[PDB]
Design a protein around this ligand. Structure first.
Ligand SMILES: [Zn+2]
Ligand SMILES: [Zn+2]
Ligand SMILES: [Zn+2]
Length: 178
């Protein structure tokens, strides 16, 4: 097993996956690491098993169809993994916790959003469709773009949204296009 958390790349109190070499802090893993379960398989392993059980699940899909899916167990898991993949980028620290807005010449967004809130929402089963999760994720970066305007700090929004979008296309097997 690894000696650092796969998500935040620090040492500490780590839980080890029994079926791959990754390790996690308790609350870096999504969902949080389960109390018992021996053996324990992490989210990367669980996502790999889905693919192996249904190899056709990797054929191309339309984004519009993916968004309308109901949050059954397997879509729930995919959304948790996609959220995890964003937290894996150290630039997610800017979007994790509840933001505030007091900048000359800007007004704050009508509907603030942050990664920990989406985390909570997923954990409490508040999303009924994939569309709900994806809207809130994209709202995070859109609020950032709009508020920071021509400050070069807007680029953090672009960069973390690219991580999100690439991972979304990968995890939900969106049809490749030019
Ligand atoms: Zn960690
Ligand atoms: Zn694993
Ligand atoms: Zn099958």
């Amino acid at each position: 097993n690894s000696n650092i958390c796969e998500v935040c790349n620090k040492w500490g109190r780590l839980f080890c996956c029994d079926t791959c070499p990754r390790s996690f802090h308790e609350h870096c893993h999504i969902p949080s690491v389960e109390a018992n379960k021996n053996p324990w398989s992490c989210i990367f392993c669980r996502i790999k098993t889905i693919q192996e059980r249904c190899p056709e699940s990797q054929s191309g899909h339309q984004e519009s169809e993916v968004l309308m899916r109901q949050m059954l167990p397997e879509e729930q898991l995919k959304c948790e993994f996609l959220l995890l993949k964003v937290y894996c980028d150290s630039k997610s620290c800017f979007f994790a916790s509840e933001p505030y807005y007091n900048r000359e010449g800007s007004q704050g967004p009508q509907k603030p959003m942050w990664l920990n809130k989406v985390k909570t929402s997923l954990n409490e089963q508040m999303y009924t469709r994939v569309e709900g999760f994806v809207q809130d994720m994209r709202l995070i970066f859109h609020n950032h773009k709009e508020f920071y305007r021509e400050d070069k700090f807007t680029r953090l929004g672009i960069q973390v949204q690219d991580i999100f979008e690439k991972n979304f296309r990968n995890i939900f097997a969106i049809q490749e296009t030019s």
